[PDB]
């Protein structure tokens, strides 16, 4: 599309500039163009892709939650009828959010996942696939909702299976995946006990492996372990 005429390296450079300027929509567009060049992504480039889209969709999701709460209050008994505007605007934001999720899922399917052979890259992309199906699930209310939830679950499960076989329990990708799959269990799959069990087991297995790490790797792993602990404290 619109990035077809720009060099791959220039798209990456501009994605980094967009990140510095907090222009995440631009950053995502540059990284989409880079993916569409057809070459595999490096570790740094995968990070840029994920940062860009997680910030774009994160803003859409926060807006959707504001509007959904307003809409829910409007449907409470005793609430005045204010017309279709709240629903219409929530639907507009929702459709835009779904479009971005579909875009990310499309990049993963064409053709990031199929070309990813190393454990790190494959787990990273499968985690992303689970996340963007999870974001679709947050807004789903219809007849494909169960299939959206199962698509998230299946992607997370494959990522977990690979990560357990091929990566140490302190690996930041493995840890972030487990954090997100635990959130999936808690608030999407209605399985709080599974969420708590996964967070605890992940935390404890990482703790036991910290002794193998350099100071810098220790800092990276413990940062994500603290997120797991934050959720355990909230949930128990």
């Amino acid at each position: 599309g619109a990035m077809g005429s720009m060099e791959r390296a220039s798209l990456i450079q501009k994605a980094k500039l967009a990140e510095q300027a907090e222009r995440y929509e631009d950053m995502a567009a540059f990284m989409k163009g880079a993916v569409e060049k057809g070459e595999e992504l490096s570790n740094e480039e995968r990070n840029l892709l994920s940062v860009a889209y997680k910030n774009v969709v994160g803003g859409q999701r926060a807006a959707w939650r504001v509007l959904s709460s307003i809409e829910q209050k409007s449907n409470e008994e005793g609430s005045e009828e204010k017309g279709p505007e709240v629903r219409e605007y929530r639907e507009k934001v929702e459709t835009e959010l779904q479009g971005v999720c579909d875009t990310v899922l499309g990049l993963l399917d064409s053709h990031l996942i199929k070309e990813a052979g190393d454990a790190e890259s494959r787990v990273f992309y499968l985690k992303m696939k689970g996340d963007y199906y999870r974001y679709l699930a947050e807004v789903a209310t219809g007849d494909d909702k169960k299939r959206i939830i199962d698509s998230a679950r299946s992607a997370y499960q494959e990522a977990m299976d690979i990560s357990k076989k091929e990566m140490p329990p302190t690996n930041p990708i493995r840890l972030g995946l487990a954090l997100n799959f635990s959130v999936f269990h808690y608030e999407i799959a209605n399985s709080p006990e599974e969420a708590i069990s996964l967070a605890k087991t992940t935390f404890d297995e990482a703790m036991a492996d910290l002794h193998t790490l350099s100071e810098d790797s220790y800092k990276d792993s413990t940062l994500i372990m603290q997120l797991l602990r934050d959720n355990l404290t909230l949930w128990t």
Partner: peptide
């Protein structure tokens, strides 16, 4: 307090 997912 909102639960954490994998974010900065």
């Amino acid at each position: 307090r909102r639960r954490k997912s994998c974010q900065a």
